[PDB]
């Protein structure tokens, strides 16, 4: 409660012996031992430097229990910019080898669901009534770096409803499996099209551990309205990206730091929606093309494996 | 698969800007911002230096989900030596100012339960039958640094059964509330005594997150047989300590790094348990005295507040 000087122990042989024992550095997976030794040592050193008290350490330890009970570790990874950091490093790798000329990547987020039924060329993906969102058409072409259309590319799409909730993750009810999620296989013309409704921005669960820490930091936990994409096709690297809805006031204040200048396409007002199966004549239209990068020596060294949900 | 040079982006302006934004370090709690800025920046820098891949990062992220789901964050804190590290730092504090003369501290561990009924001088704490454990008597005096008995000290004791399980945390069933957990208030002579059963060493839940990571590090998750104590007294600092059962082959291979050479008292065989209320005539006996350290200006600046179970 009263300030005192930190007593420094990190460089002592006892602490260094403890770090080597606990990480088992130098059976066991050597790479995991190496990573643990470095992260544990950095934590010990930070506790020494900032005089992080046992009360503070146990608050952090018990915070991790709540974070996992909430299922929110990946949400915090986005909120603390760790997920953006991974893109920064992948972007720097692409810049060094000259693979940075396609549509830019941005974060995947934690809300992808595998298994959407694949449609030929066009998918209508709003399965459930949403009185609060107007119809939205997203369309474009999948091309390579040379401008030619990519046949048989798989474009997957997911976004939120007018309350900012995703199917499979709705805390107010159970949406239909794959509501506002689709997948289209492009034809020879490389064209894809999604017919859906306009999303609104996401907000962290207000009593969740992510928002609790953000609240303590003085930060909001909101995202601007956006739509996610995967684009997969042989001969190209797997594209993970997004675009933001034009004009959202949170576009340059995303709590997950995912907005990119090239990922803010214009939205157009259009008519004749009924002829497209849309629920209203006037609709908003976004033209967005995906420019892919090629595999190098047949390899995609930036595809990411992580725990992902799946549905019927 | 093939080796390449790790990209270095940490010292770029974009990363430094991202770190300041994410920690908000520069509304909010300044101390939390400071700690987050440091811990998050260290993590980014570690990712650069070791070229930690996204696949690796996400495995750690999803591991954290499992760790919290299992409710094991504090178990891993002990298993990775973090809990011992906190004691190393408190011990160095005491040494610097000359408060290091008493019974040594060691780790609390995550299995304390508040509320044991305070008995006078002696508590019998084995409520549940355990055919795998013989009787154990633990007895001693609570004194200050000057050797005078401390009257009214509260000595709390908790430990495992012969399967290595604690009441309130037993995976094979439900023990009685406060089984193998006791509280004793010393009288004028400073003496305490617990009548209990002999513990067996603890092992991490085999399918839990802590053992999963220890397995990946090539480490076991076992503790020697031991007994925990709190000693709370109005004029002294609160002592958190333990002792290990003499002769346990894991005394010098504790996965939580909590063994101290001053905390391994002799065990002697005795007879006469019936008159003590023990379930058998023959029993094992441990004399263990607590030497407390005084408060400074009536304050205890080493007492630890953390989430604790109660019953
Ligand atoms: C560094 C190399 C890599 C190793 C680490 C890898 C992970 C680093 C990731 C980037 C940094 C993220 C840090 C996350 C932990 C922050 C915990 C704050 C949560 C919190 O609200 O604690 C409050 C107390 O704060 C306080 O007392 C002050 C802040 C608390 C200390 C936070 C750090 C503790 C370090 C030990 C935990 C292990 C690391 C954590 C990831 C609440 O307190 P309350 O009890 O009133 O609760 C009331 C609510 N229910
Ligand atoms: C509780 C108090 C004490 C806290 C300790 C904090 C100090 C840091 C020191 C320890 C922290 C380590 C945390 C876990 C890292 C390793 C977890 C991996 C365990 C594991 O089984 O993953 C394997 C791969 O490991 C790997 O690939 C290596 C993964 C290493 C990741 C390191 C970076 C993670 C950063 C996360 C911090 C996030 C902060 C904000 C959320 C297998 O993987 P699998 O997928 O095949 O599993 C399917 C089953 N075999
Ligand atoms: Cl129990
Ligand atoms: Fe999203
Ligand atoms: Fe224990």
A86 with B57: Cβ contact below 8 A: yes
Half-sphere exposure at residue B229, Cβ-oriented, CA atoms within 13 angstroms: 28
Strand B191-197 and strand B122-124: the pairing is parallel
Calpha distance A260→A244 (Å, rounded): 9
Cβ atoms B150, B233 nearer than 8 A = yes
**Residue whose token pair is 């008597």:** B137
Q: Which one of B63, B79, B83 would you pick to mutate in the ligand 2 pocket, going by the greatest count of ligand atoms within 8 A of its CB?
A: B63
Residue A280: Cβ within 10 Å count: 10
Distance, CA of A194 to chain centre: 20
**Residue whose token pair is 């939580």:** B256
**Residue whose token pair is 């050597």:** A30
Cβ atoms B63, B198 nearer than 8 A = no
Closest alpha carbon to B274 in B137, B71, B83, B152: B137
Q: Does B96 touch chain A (CB under 8 A)?
A: yes
Residue B175: Cβ within 10 Å count: 19
Calpha distance A31→B250 (Å, rounded): 27
Q: Which residue's CA is minimally distant from atom 37 of ligand 2? A: B61
Strand A283-287 and strand A268-270: the pairing is antiparallel
Closest alpha carbon to A225 in A258, A193, A188, A178: A258
Strand B283-287 and strand A290-291: the pairing is unpaired
- Tokens matching residue B135: 């009787």
Residue B228 labelled as part of a binding site: yes
Calpha distance B93→B301 (Å, rounded): 10
Q: Which one of B34, B35, B49, B68 would you pick to mutate in the ligand 1 pocket, going by the greatest count of ligand atoms within 8 A of its CB?
A: B35
Calpha distance A104→A261 (Å, rounded): 9
Strand B135-143 and strand B191-197: the pairing is antiparallel
Closest alpha carbon to A231 in A102, A99, A95: A102
Cβ atoms B37, B25 nearer than 8 A = yes
A67 lines ligand 2 (CB under 6 A): no
Q: Which residue's CA is minimally distant from atom 39 of ligand 1? A: A60
Calpha distance A247→A249 (Å, rounded): 6
**At what angle are helices A54-69 and A209-217 packed, to 10 degrees?**
140
Q: Which residues neighbour A306 within 8 Å (Cβ) at sequence distance 6 or greater?
A: A74, A108, B54, B55, B58, B59, B61, B62
Give me the residue from B7, B68, B80 closest to A69, CB to CB.
Answer: B68
Cross-strand partners of B232: B154
Measured between alpha carbons, how far is residue A113 from residues A230, A231, A310 in Å? Answer: 11, 14, 5
Say which experimental method was used.
X-ray
User: What backbone phi and psi angles, to 5 degrees, belong to A152?
Assistant: 70, 20
B22 with A93: Cβ contact below 8 A: no
Closest chain B C-alpha to A202 CA, distance in angstroms: 18
Superfamily (CATH H level) for A1-312? Aromatic compound dioxygenase (2.60.130.10)
User: Which one of 1.10.20.10, 2.60.130.10, 3.90.550.10, 3.40.228.10 gives the CATH number of domain B1-311?
Assistant: 2.60.130.10
DSSP string computed for chain A: ----PPPP-TTSHHHHHHHHHHHT-----HHHHHHHHHHHHHHHHHHHHHT--HHHHHHHHHHHHHHHHTT-HHHHHHHTTHHHHHHHHHHHHHHHHT---SSPP----S--EE-PPEEESEEE---S--TT--EEEEEEEEE-TTS-B-TT-EEEEE---TTS--TT--SSS-PPTTTTEEEEE--TT-EEEEEEE-----B--TTSHHHHHHHHHT---B--SEEEEEEE-TTBPPEEEEEEPTT-TTTT--TT----GGG----EEE---GGGT-SSSSEEEEE--EE--B-BTTB-TT------EE--
Domain locations along chain A: 1-312
Closest chain B C-alpha to A308 CA, distance in angstroms: 10
Classify residue B91 by burial, with Cβ atoms within 10 Å: 0-12, 13-18, 19+: buried
Longest Cα–Cα distance of chain B, Å, equals 76
Q: Which one of A39, A72, A109 would you pick to mutate in the ligand 2 pocket, going by the greatest count of ligand atoms within 8 A of its CB?
A: A39
Q: Does B67 touch chain A (CB under 8 A)?
A: yes
CA of B55 to the centre of ligand 4 (A): 20
Residue B110: Cβ within 10 Å count: 23
Cross-strand partners of A226: A244
Cβ atoms B216, B262 nearer than 8 A = no
Cβ atoms B222, B248 nearer than 8 A = no
A218 with B28: Cβ contact below 8 A: yes
Calpha distance A283→A279 (Å, rounded): 9
Q: Does B35 touch chain A (CB under 8 A)?
A: yes
Q: Which residue's CA is minimally distant from atom 11 of ligand 2? A: A36
A219 with B28: Cβ contact below 8 A: yes
**At what angle are helices A54-69 and B82-97 packed, to 10 degrees?**
170
Half-sphere exposure at residue B115, Cβ-oriented, CA atoms within 13 angstroms: 10
Cβ atoms B194, B157 nearer than 8 A = yes
Give me the residue from A32, A46, A82 closest to B57, CB to CB.
Answer: A82
Half-sphere exposure at residue A259, Cβ-oriented, CA atoms within 13 angstroms: 21
A64 lines ligand 2 (CB under 6 A): yes
């Amino acid at each position: 409660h009263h300030h005192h000087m930190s007593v420094k122990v990190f460089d002592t042989k006892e602490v260094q012996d403890l770090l080597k024992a606990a990480s088992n550095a130098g059976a066991g997976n050597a790479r995991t031992q190496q990573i643990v030794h470095r992260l544990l040592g950095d934590l010990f050193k930070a506790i020494d430097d900032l005089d992080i008290t046992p009360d503070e350490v146990w608050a952090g330890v018990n915070y991790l229990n709540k974070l996992g009970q909430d299922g929110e570790a990946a949400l915090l990874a986005a909120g603390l910019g760790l997920e953006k950091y991974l893109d920064i490093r992948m972007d720097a790798e692409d810049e060094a080898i000259g693979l940075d000329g396609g549509t830019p990547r941005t974060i995947e987020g934690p809300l992808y669901v595998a298994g959407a039924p694949v449609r030929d060329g066009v998918a209508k993906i709003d399965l459930d009534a949403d009185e609060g969102a107007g119809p939205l058409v997203i369309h474009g072409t999948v091309t390579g770096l040379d401008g030619k259309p990519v046949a048989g590319a798989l474009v997957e799409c997911w976004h939120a409803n007018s309350h900012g909730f995703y199917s499979h993750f709705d805390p107010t009810g159970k949406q239909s499996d794959f509501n506002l999620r689709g997948a289209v296989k492009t034809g020879a013309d490389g064209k894809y099209e999604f017919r859906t409704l306009m999303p609104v921005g996401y907000g962290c669960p207000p009593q969740g551990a992510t928002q609790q820490l953000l609240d303590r930091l003085g930060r909001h936990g909101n995202r601007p309205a956006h739509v996610h994409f995967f684009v997969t096709s042989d001969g190209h690297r797997k594209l993970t990206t997004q675009f933001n809805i034009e004009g959202d006031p949170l576009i340059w204040d995303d709590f997950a730091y995912a907005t990119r200048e090239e990922l803010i396409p214009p939205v157009t007002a259009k008519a004749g929606g009924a002829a497209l199966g849309l629920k209203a004549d006037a609709y908003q239209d976004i033209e967005f093309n995906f420019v892919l990068t090629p595999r190098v020596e047949g390899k995609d060294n930036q595809i990411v494996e992580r725990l992902r949900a799946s549905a019927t």
